[PDB]
Swiss-Prot record, chain B:
It comes from Saccharomyces cerevisiae (strain ATCC 204508 / S288c) (Baker's yeast). Zn(2+) binds at C36, C39, C55, C58. Component of the RNA polymerase II (Pol II) complex consisting of 12 subunits. The chain holds residues 1128 to 1223 of 1224 of the full protein. It is found in: Nucleus. The binding of ribonucleoside triphosphate to the RNA polymerase II transcribing complex probably involves a two-step mechanism. The initial binding seems to occur at the entry (E) site and involves a magnesium ion coordinated by three conserved aspartate residues of the two largest RNA Pol II subunits. Present with 18700 molecules/cell in log phase SD medium. DNA-dependent RNA polymerase catalyzes the transcription of DNA into RNA using the four ribonucleoside triphosphates as substrates. Second largest component of RNA polymerases II which synthesizes mRNA precursors and many functional non-coding RNAs. Proposed to contribute to the polymerase catalytic activity and forms the polymerase active center together with the largest subunit. Pol II is the central component of the basal RNA polymerase II transcription machinery. A zinc finger (C4-type) spans 36-58. Belongs to the RNA polymerase beta chain family. It comes from the Eukaryota. This is DNA-directed RNA polymerase II subunit RPB2.
From Swiss-Prot, chain D:
Associates with TFIID-IIA (DA complex) to form TFIID-IIA-IIB (DAB-complex) which is then recognized by polymerase II. It comes from Saccharomyces cerevisiae (strain ATCC 204508 / S288c) (Baker's yeast). Present with 6750 molecules/cell in log phase SD medium. This is Transcription initiation factor IIB. General factor that plays a major role in the activation of eukaryotic genes transcribed by RNA polymerase II. The chain holds residues 16 to 173 of 345 of the full protein.
Swiss-Prot record, chain G:
It comes from Saccharomyces cerevisiae (strain ATCC 204508 / S288c). GO terms for cellular component: nucleoplasm; nucleus; RNA polymerase I complex; RNA polymerase II, core complex; RNA polymerase III complex. Keywords: DNA-binding, DNA-directed RNA polymerase, Nucleus, Ribosome biogenesis, Transcription. DNA-dependent RNA polymerases catalyze the transcription of DNA into RNA using the four ribonucleoside triphosphates as substrates. Common component of RNA polymerases I, II and III which synthesize ribosomal RNA precursors, mRNA precursors and many functional non-coding RNAs, and small RNAs, such as 5S rRNA and tRNAs, respectively. Pol II is the central component of the basal RNA polymerase II transcription machinery. RNA polymerase complexes are composed of mobile elements that move relative to each other. It is found in: Nucleus. This is DNA-directed RNA polymerases I, II, and III subunit RPABC1. One of its GO terms (biological process) is termination of RNA polymerase III transcription. The keyword Transcription applies. Belongs to the archaeal Rpo5/eukaryotic RPB5 RNA polymerase subunit family. GO terms for molecular function: DNA binding; DNA-directed RNA polymerase activity. It comes from the Eukaryota. Its main location: nucleus. Transmembrane segments: none annotated.
UniProtKB/Swiss-Prot annotation, chain K:
It is found in: Nucleus. The tandem 7 residues repeats in the C-terminal domain (CTD) can be highly phosphorylated. The phosphorylation activates Pol II. Phosphorylation occurs mainly at residues 'Ser-2' and 'Ser-5' of the heptapeptide repeat. The phosphorylated form of Pol II appears to carry, on average, one phosphate per repeat. The phosphorylation state is believed to result from the balanced action of site-specific CTD kinases and phosphatases, and a 'CTD code' that specifies the position of Pol II within the transcription cycle has been proposed. The C-terminal domain (CTD) serves as a platform for assembly of factors that regulate transcription initiation, elongation, termination and mRNA processing. Mutagenesis experiments demonstrate that the minimum viable CTD contains eight consensus Y-S-P-T-S-P-[A-S-N-G] heptapeptide repeats. Identical and simultaneous substitutions in a number of consecutive repeats are lethal: 'Ser-2' -> 'Ala-2' (14 repeats), 'Ser-5' -> 'Ala-5' (15 repeats), '2-Ser-Pro-Thr-Ser-5'-> '2-Ala-Pro-Thr-Ala-5' (10 repeats), 'Ser-2'-> 'Glu-2' (15 repeats), 'Ser-5' -> 'Glu-5' (12 repeats), '2-Ser-Pro-3' -> '2-Pro-Ser-3' (15 repeats) and 'Tyr-1' -> 'Phe-1' (12 repeats). Belongs to the RNA polymerase beta' chain family.
């Protein structure tokens, strides 16, 4: 119950900010019929918007992160060798830069 | 035609695993072997005309199962037991 | 054939167990007792001798034998024999672990260095992954280089009890070449007596001292008793590989073409029989040691040839003898090139051309390939007449059949088939036929990167042999028409065909999951043409607008009204494109001009599926975050968008025909 | 055991059957009935596309040497160990005679056929009491 | 051991049948039309087994049930009728 | 031994093919016979069908055309050594790789005829037509100034 | 709870784990010059009861081992002073739901 | 010998038989593949017990084929061979090296060295019989035989027997 | 804090150009690389030397060594991995496999 | 698992079988003991299931007299299965020829005695399978009967078992 | 290398993120349960502006 109430907090703040009473009645001019229709459509689309069980999410994530590594460039080390050093630590840095406020 | 690693990856990403299975069997080896899981070995002879499935080295005549397999996987397996290795059971035993 | 169906209860793999071999068990499953190093041509004719090459194991080619289990070639899994050895040898797949364990346990006592009387190793025995415990035992055991019978002083308040077996030392062990030596310092005289003797660690004494270890010491040392006990880790009796792993290539003029593995095994037998004759007769105690070292050397080299490079150990000619890590390495060393990828069947490979008249779920397939391919079906009361007619059509005419399968393992080929017009094609049967149209078919292009390149398609069969596909899907395919080649596969059963149809087809792959925005798109030429069409200043005439209105396949039979009437009916390109846009779709752009009376004519707004104003441009109508394609797919249902691409693609193509458009140097100079 | 596979159509039986081979699909069919007999043929040309045993005999010759990923300290041990088994076979003298007739035939610029036929002529007898030595060069001449 | 199942009440899976088992039940229904197991929806002259399966699912009289899994090993049971084909 | 389906009628008494005739893909051109001697030459383990083990070379099974100008001459050591040559017209088709003098590779979409080719006042019908979208991406002005 | 100015001999460190069930801990001043939790990158940490741990295990149907770990020698681990067998719930400011449950087991 | 035990057996069925009355069809199925069966583990399987309230309750469809399997737990009567038990079986066929006694499911045979030598064997008998006082192979042929071992192998089960014991053989 | 900083660094590097991807893929990668109590590079030695099944562990080219170590240790793989089910030729319990298909005689009678 | 040798000679002297243990577990989770059945009671109990499945088949198409039984169940078994079970006809002939009591109530009264005596199950199942009347020749025939049980108690139960059974 | 690193991650029926063994990574996947499709770069309407314009 705590996880289910919790994991939609960004959604619920957005939804409340959009459907505040003053804003909807001053700019949107609904009917009772249209109000019920838009609520039913919103919840139906959200139920259609769940993660499907059984996806190979890590595989899809892998291919997604793998695609733009072919379009790379080569101061501060950037590009492919910096990505390889970060992903493949290597207790060694080549750029010991630290930021201080 | 070559079927490759990345092709297998994106087929996994689609998740058409029954297609993956039937492609990798029927367009390839489609082999059959009898085994003895009491051995766990490869060695079971089969007089198929007389329904005789003697297991020398295990002397049992009840532990007799056929599985469908890669001839690729058998090439691996007979090679590996020549390389001083692999038992192959037939059901789970741990939960 | 029917694969000789028997009453073995078929099930599947669930668990796999690894381990080693006890020599008695591998002798028990052995059938062959090979003594002759040479194989074929008895005195010297045929029908190979009772040494190698099937006396009593798997057959050679075409023949009965397979030790008389009668399974021809393609049903016998091989059969197994063994060979005997004079002395036991080491093993390169274990050498380091051998060094660690012989450092650990005490030789001449058969007892562990440490047994539950240092609390440090007590908690090291308590920790249990599988091997960090073993690493702890190995780093604790390096010191205290004497084995003792009475170590424990602080187990008690201050008293000593009896734990160990022997007062002997362990010798300092240096790894050398392909053997092991030890220098027992042992320091037992009146002086310091630093005088170590360097003696070769004989595999017999390591085997016997391993045979004198406790089962609970095996459990502490990570050896599972039922499958892994270190005397099995030392090699005494060696199994043989079957004839299929080392096949005679039959080298096509006179040779059987014996290969690398049988060659090396023949070398092993020759060296073993030489060593056994040498030790049986008068051994002068110099040649016997280098001979048994050669035996260990050759069995190690056959085992693998990628060892620490003191030898190389090839066999003629100058190409090195290919051992097993070479057989099973990376880059198609039997695992990547045989298991997670391999060759296939039902394959096609040609070069594509574009087309503006075929929608996304189709593909153009050449008819020679459709003759070459096949697809099984079944015989029902439903398909009976069409299948019978196609069988009568012969193996040639394009809705054609090639094979028929009755109830049993039946392969009747229609090419010869002198009883051609006579088969009744009973129920419960299977026929093979060519690809008729709109069959589901999976597509590939090298090299795949992401969830794209794997589309499914229907088929409209095309002559003039090559492929054909839609200009839409070209950029997720990531291929211009520079001569790249495609790869095609055809499913065989209905589960597979259904899941390809429901999952890998285009119209539910319109938005890429990876990039959280649709990655399809109308592309360059129709994009330029629709930018030409959408402009305010142009109009169009009857003879055009009538022809485009017939060109849209789902036109309602209603003309739109004249936009402007007075001497002539005329229409805007926006007015005619509003027919092709399906109803009830709404978009807003509103960028930097767009004061509802757009002077600079940017922006885009559609009410009820009809254009009102604006200039069609890729930053509205191509792939974008607030894309039109995104809007229609998310709202209306993700297959009407396929016909949307078909509609606007066909319309812009046919209008651009009679318009005409090009560039030149007069663009460039200013 | 009789070591024998005979192929016969189980539905025609007119003779040892008039059968054909479809190598393009690797199958065999009785041409009268039109039924398969067996499948998955093994190629008979691709092995010759892939890569003197009759004169070297049943025992097989092996020259050994050095490579790239090896050490000179033990390939010289190998170079002095390559003659540790030449006395086990008479094939060291067979290949010495083969080398010497190679010396002679290529000295007289004789071709490969003449070289292999002289190899055949030595391998034919190679040992009789009629041979009996005789300077070891008279037999090669 | 402890019967390895769950009652039909207090099921905590989603009540929405999703795409993979959709593909599987459509494929299986094609196999029963493929080997002439009896149809339940009436015919309208069409002979495509996939079309027969789609129409049968749409009228919602498919006589099949479905089992789901959990990482423990215990399983749930559902009929395709109490599921609702929504997507 | 193990004869092909070559339909061997195209050969002559010297075991060669006369030039100028046409050949299909699978057809045979050469003929071999095993000269061993001694292996129980023509009465052992085979029918008669004497000593073939025939390794006759067929043509590559797709291309078909006209054989031409067959020559035979002894080799280095003196044997019967054979070379043949086949001539085959290949009309350009839909799937050929054509490039420019500036790197505009690709292939051929379709071919129509002059009744719907675009044409000018003097009727100078084109040989070939490509997409303008090669030009402002590959930046090939040299093609245009050449034209 | 002990604070040392500088290093301590191992002959003091050997009798540190003496007198169970009492437990001994040592910190450096320079290691504790900065309150680590007040760094904005570390999320909130919170302790559990063994009862709550047992409830979590019987709810999610796990068995004690597949749950993600946390090292004993972690700085937040020495900050909370927890020993083996304790479960830590962790809440971090997520970017699609803000608040988000998570769990770690001390090992 | 004749024993009762709970047995669980799995059976499969073709997808064309998915009609309304398939429970009884599965029952019929269970009868013909239980009846007339000899296994190595439990000897010969005679017949089924507790026909009513049988438990099948669920089946799984194979993923690659429409066939579905069904496990059946049931009570049954089975015969279990053993070593060293005097039984009064009957003889049908005989040989010159020894008679072949058919004790229930087995054909227990006594080899030429296991008949007692004080038995007055006559070679001139049709069938050749080993009779001394009353142990004659007849239409009844009740001979006290002891199976000192039943040699189960690849499934052509044979038992070995002996009559080298006092009152064994004779009736 | 380490996995937060690591995700921040990799996001900066791949968002220097060619941006972007959804957060969830990158976060999944970062957290699966950190979820062992410590940092773990995905090498031949790094993630592979773990309590992980031998067949995925031998698909990453440490082959002869990892199979000999696995044979010496004599452990088991449950074969609930895609690599095992492919190389033993079965459907992996994956996607279309993550469930099973049951036949109901009672539902068949109920909808006769 | 390590070839699981467990070399046991099978004998009547409590030298049991490798699978036929005294203690098992059942499908319900409760302890399933060993069940052994004598020749007489086995022949009696098989006819219950025989007539039950015959009337069950008769209801399927709707929706002690051993001379009758040897042909009757032959007809029933050839109705449903094939004629290959001449072996089964021989087994039931053995079940009905040499069982110690032809009727059912004598065997049932013997079982009602044995449920109160609480004898050894395999021993008394062997005694019910065998057909003898005097305990000393039963002892000299079977050394398990020689060693396991005192002759006087064996005789005093053998006479009150043998009075009920129909003599042959 | 990376596609070898992330094979067996499989979302179960309980919306977790486990491996073949079952090592949970994300208890709810991606902290939302929302897939890789239904995503737009839309805006919340709360942060921006003033306190005065916000209450306005
Ligand atoms: Mg694992
Ligand atoms: Zn076995
Ligand atoms: Zn065989
Ligand atoms: Zn010692
Ligand atoms: Zn025929």
């Amino acid at each position: 119950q705590n996880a289910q109430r919790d994991a939609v907090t960004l959604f619920c703040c957005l939804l409340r900010s959009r459907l505040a009473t003053r804003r909807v009645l001053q700019e949107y001019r609904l009917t009772k019929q249209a109000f019920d229709w838009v609520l039913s459509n919103i919840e139906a689309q959200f139920l259609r918007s769940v993660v499907h069980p059984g996806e190979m999410v890590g595989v899809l994530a892998a291919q997604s992160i793998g695609e733009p590594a072919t379009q790379m460039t080569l101061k501060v080390t950037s590009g492919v060798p910096r990505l390889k050093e970060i992903l493949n630590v290597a207790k060694n840095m080549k750029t010991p830069s630290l930021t201080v406020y | 035609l070559r079927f490759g690693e990345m092709e297998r990856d994106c087929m996994i990403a689609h998740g058409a695993a029954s297609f993956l299975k039937e492609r990798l069997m029927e367009a390839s080896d489609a082999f059959r072997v009898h085994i003895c899981g009491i051995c766990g070995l490869m060695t079971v002879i089969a007089k198929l005309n007389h329904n005789q499935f003697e297991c020398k080295g295990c002397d049992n005549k009840i532990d007799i199962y056929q599985i469908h397999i890669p001839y690729a996987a058998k090439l691996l397996f007979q090679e590996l037991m020549a390389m001083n290795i692999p038992r192959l059971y037939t059901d789970r035993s741990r939960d | 054939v029917g694969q000789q169906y028997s009453s073995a209860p078929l099930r599947t793999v669930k668990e796999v167990q690894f381990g080693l071999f006890s020599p008695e068990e591998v002798r028990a499953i052995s059938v062959a007792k090979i003594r002759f190093p040479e194989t074929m041509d008895e005195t010297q004719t045929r029908a190979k001798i009772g040494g190698l090459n099937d006396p009593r194991l798997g057959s050679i080619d075409r023949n009965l034998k397979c030790q008389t289990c009668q399974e021809g070639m393609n049903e016998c899994p091989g059969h197994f024999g063994h060979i005997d050895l004079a002395k036991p040898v080491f093993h390169v797949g274990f050498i380091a672990k051998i060094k660690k364990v012989c450092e650990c346990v005490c030789m001449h006592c058969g007892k562990l260095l440490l047994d539950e009387h240092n609390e440090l190793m007590r908690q090291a025995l308590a920790i249990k992954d599988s091997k960090k415990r073993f690493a702890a035992i190995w780093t604790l055991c390096k010191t205290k280089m004497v084995c003792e019978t009475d170590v424990p002083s602080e187990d008690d308040p201050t008293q000593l009890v009896s734990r160990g077996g022997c007062g002997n030392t362990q010798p300092t062990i240096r790894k050398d070449g392909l053997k092991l030596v030890g220098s027992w310092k042992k320091d037992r005289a009146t002086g310091d007596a630093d005088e170590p003797e360097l003696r070769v660690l004989s595999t017999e004494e390591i085997l016997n001292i391993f045979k004198h270890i406790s089962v609970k010491d095996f459990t502490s040392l990570g050896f599972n008793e039922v499958f892994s006990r270190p005397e099995w880790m030392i090699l005494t009796c060696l199994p043989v590989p079957p004839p299929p792993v080392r096949p005679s290539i039959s080298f096509n003029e006179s040779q059987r073409g014996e290969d690398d593995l049988t060659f090396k095994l023949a070398d092993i037998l020759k060296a073993n029989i030489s060593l056994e004759t040498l030790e049986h007769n008068g051994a002068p105690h110099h040649a016997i040691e280098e001979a048994e070292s050669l035996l260990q050397f050759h069995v190690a080299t056959y085992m693998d040839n990628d060892i620490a490079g003191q030898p190389q150990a090839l066999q003629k000619s100058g190409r090195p003898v290919k051992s097993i890590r070479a057989r099973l390495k990376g880059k198609e060393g039997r695992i990547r090139g045989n298991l997670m990828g391999k060759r296939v069947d039902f394959s096609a490979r040609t070069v594509i051309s574009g087309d503006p008249n075929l929608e996304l779920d189709q593909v153009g397939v050449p008819k020679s390939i459709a003759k070459t391919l096949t697809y099984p079906e079944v015989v029902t009361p439903y398909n009976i007449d069409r299948l019978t007619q196609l069988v009568r059509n012969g193996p040639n005419e394009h809705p054609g059949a090639k094979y028929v399968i009755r109830d049993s393992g039946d392969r009747i080929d229609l090419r010869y088939s002198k009883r051609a017009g006579d088969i009744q094609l009973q129920y419960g049967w299977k026929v093979e036929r060519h690809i008729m149209d709109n069959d589901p078919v999976l597509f590939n292009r090298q090299p795949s990167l992401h969830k794209m390149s794997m589309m499914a398609h229907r088929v409209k069969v095309i002559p003039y042999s090559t492929f054909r596909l839609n200009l839409s899907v070209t950029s997720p395919y990531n291929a211009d028409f520079d001569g790249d080649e495609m790869n095609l596969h055809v499913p065989q059963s209905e589960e597979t065909r259904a899941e390809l149809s429901q999952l890998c087809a285009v119209p539910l792959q319109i938005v890429s999951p990876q990039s959280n925005k649709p990655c399809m798109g109308i592309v360059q030429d129709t994009l330029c043409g629709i930018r030409k069409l959408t402009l305010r200043d142009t109009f169009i005439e009857l003879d055009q607008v009538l022809n485009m209105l017939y060109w849209v396949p789902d036109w309602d039979g209603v003309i739109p009204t004249p936009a402007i009437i007075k001497p002539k009916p005329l229409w805007s390109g926006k007015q005619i494109l509003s027919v092709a846009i399906p109803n009830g779709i709404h978009l807003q752009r509103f960028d930097e001009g767009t004061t509802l009376l757009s002077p600079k004519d940017n922006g885009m707004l559609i009410i009820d599926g009809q254009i009102i104003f604006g200039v069609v441009e890729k930053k509205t109508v191509g792939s974008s975050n607030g894309g039109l394609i995104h809007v229609v797919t998310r709202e209306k249902g993700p297959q009407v968008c396929a016909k949307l691409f078909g509609n606007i693609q066909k319309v812009v193509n046919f209008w651009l025909l009679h318009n005409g458009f090009s560039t030149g140097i007069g663009d460039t100079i200013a | 055991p009789n070591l024998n596979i005979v192929l016969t159509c189980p539905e025609c039986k007119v003779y040892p059957p008039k059968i054909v081979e479809r190598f393009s699909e690797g199958d065999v069919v009785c041409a009268l009935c039109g039924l398969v007999l067996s499948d998955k043929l093994v190629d008979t040309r691709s092995e010759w596309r892939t890569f003197n045993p009759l004169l070297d005999g049943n025992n097989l010759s092996t020259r050994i040497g050095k490579g790239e990923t090896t050490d000179m300290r033990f390939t010289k041990e190998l170079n002095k160990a390559q003659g540790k088994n030449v006395m086990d076979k008479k094939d060291n003298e067979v290949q010495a005679a083969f080398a010497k007739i190679t010396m002679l035939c290529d000295a007289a610029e004789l071709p490969k056929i003449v070289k292999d036929c002289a190899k055949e002529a030595y391998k034919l007898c190679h040992d009789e009491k009629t041979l009996k030595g005789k300077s070891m060069e008279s037999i090669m001449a | 051991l402890k019967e390895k199942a769950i009652p039909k009440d207090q099921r905590a899976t989603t009540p929405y049948m999703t795409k993979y088992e959709r593909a599987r039940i459509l494929g299986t229904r094609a196999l029963q039309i493929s080997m002439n197991a009896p149809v339940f929806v009436d015919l309208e002259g069409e002979t495509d087994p996939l079309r027969i399966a789609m129409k049968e699912l749409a009228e919602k009289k498919i006589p099949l049930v479905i089992r789901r899994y959990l990482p423990d090993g215990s399983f749930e049971d559902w009929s395709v009728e109490e599921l609702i084909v929504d997507l | 031994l193990r004869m092909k389906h070559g339909t061997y009628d195209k050969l002559d008494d010297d075991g060669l093919i006369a030039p100028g005739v046409r050949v299909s893909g699978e057809d045979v051109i050469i003929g071999k016979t095993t000269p061993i001697s001694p292996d129980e030459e023509e009465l052992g383990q085979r029918t008669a069908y004497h000593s073939k083990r025939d390794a006759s070379t067929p043509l590559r099974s797709t291309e078909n055309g006209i054989v031409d100008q067959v020559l035979v001459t002894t080799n280095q050591d003196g044997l019967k050594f054979v070379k043949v040559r086949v001539r085959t017209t290949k009309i350009p088709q839909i799937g050929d790789k054509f490039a420019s003098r500036h790197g505009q590779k690709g292939t051929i979409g379709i071919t129509y005829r002059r009744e719907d080719m675009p044409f000018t006042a003097e009727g100078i019908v084109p040989d070939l037509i490509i997409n303008p979208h090669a030009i402002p991406s590959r930046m090939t002005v040299a093609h245009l100034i050449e034209c | 709870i002990f604070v040392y100015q500088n290093n301590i001999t191992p002959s003091a460190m050997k009798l540190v784990p003496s007198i169970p069930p009492a437990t001994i801990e040592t910190f450096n001043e320079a290691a504790l010059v900065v309150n680590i939790t007040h760094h904005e990158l570390v999320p909130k940490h919170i302790r559990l009861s063994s009862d709550e741990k047992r409830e979590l295990l019987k709810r999610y149907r796990l068995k004690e081992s597949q749950l993600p770990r946390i090292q004993r020698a972690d700085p937040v681990a020495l900050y909370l002073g927890l020993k083996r067998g304790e479960v830590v719930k962790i809440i971090r400011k997520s970017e699609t739901s803000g608040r988000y449950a998570s769990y770690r087991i001390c090992m | 010998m004749f024993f009762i035990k709970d047995l669980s057996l799995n059976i499969t069925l073709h997808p064309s038989f998915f009609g309304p009355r398939m429970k009884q069809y599965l029952k019929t199925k269970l009868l013909e593949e239980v009846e007339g069966s000899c296994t190595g583990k439990f000897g010969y399987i005679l017949c089924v017990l507790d026909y009513d309230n049988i438990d099948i309750q669920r089946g799984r469809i194979l993923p690659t084929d429409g066939s579905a399997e069904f496990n059946v737990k049931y009570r049954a009567v089975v015969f279990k061979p053993f070593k060293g038990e005097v039984v009064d079986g009957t003889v049908v066929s005989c040989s010159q090296h020894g008679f072949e006694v058919q004790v229930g499911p087995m054909k227990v045979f006594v080899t030429k060295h296991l008949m007692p030598q004080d038995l007055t064997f006559n070679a001139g008998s049709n069938p050749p019989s080993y009779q001394s006082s009353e142990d004659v192979i007849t239409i009844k042929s009740r001979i006290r035989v002891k199976i000192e071992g039943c040699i189960s192998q690849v499934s052509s089960i044979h038992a070995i027997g002996s009559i080298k014991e006092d009152y064994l053989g004779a009736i | 804090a380490g996995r937060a900083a690591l995700y921040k660094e990799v996001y900066n590097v791949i968002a220097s150009d060619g941006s972007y991807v959804n957060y969830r893929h990158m976060a999944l990668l970062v957290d699966v690389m950190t979820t062992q109590g410590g940092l773990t590079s995905v090498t031949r030695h790094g993630f592979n030397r773990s309590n992980t099944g031998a067949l995925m562990r031998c698909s990453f080219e440490e082959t002869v060594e990892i199979l000999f170590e696995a044979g010496a240790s004599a452990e088991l793989d449950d074969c609930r991995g895609v690599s095992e089910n492919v190389i033993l030729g079965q459907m992996a319990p994956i996607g279309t496999g993550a469930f099973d298909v049951m036949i109901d005689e009672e539902s068949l009678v109920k909808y006769m | 698992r390590l070839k699981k040798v467990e070399e046991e000679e099978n004998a009547a002297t409590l030298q049991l079988g490798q699978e036929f243990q005294l203690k098992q577990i059942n499908h319900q989770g409760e302890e399933e003991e060993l069940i052994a059945l004598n020749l007489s009671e086995a022949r009696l109990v098989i006819k219950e299931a025989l007539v039950e499945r015959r009337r069950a088949f008769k209801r399927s198409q709707k929706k002690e007299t051993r001379e009758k039984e040897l042909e009757s169940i032959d007809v029933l078994l050839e109705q449903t299965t094939g004629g290959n079970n001449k072996d089964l006809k021989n087994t039931m002939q053995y079940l009905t020829n040499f069982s110690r009591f032809r009727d059912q109530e004598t065997v049932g009264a013997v079982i009602q005695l044995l449920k109160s005596t609480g004898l050894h199950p395999f021993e008394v199942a062997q005694l019910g399978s065998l057909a003898c009347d005097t305990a000393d020749e039963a002892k000299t025939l079977i050394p398990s009967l020689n060693n396991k049980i005192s002759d006087d108690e064996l005789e005093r139960i053998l006479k009150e078992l043998s009075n009920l059974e129909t003599l042959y | 290398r990376l596609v070898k690193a992330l094979e067996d991650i499989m979302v179960h029926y309980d919306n977790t993120t486990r491996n073949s063994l079952g090592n949970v990574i994300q208890f709810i996947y991606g902290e939302d349960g929302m897939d890789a499709a239904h995503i737009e770069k839309q805006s919340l309407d709360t942060i921006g502006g003033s306190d005065a314009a916000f209450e306005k």
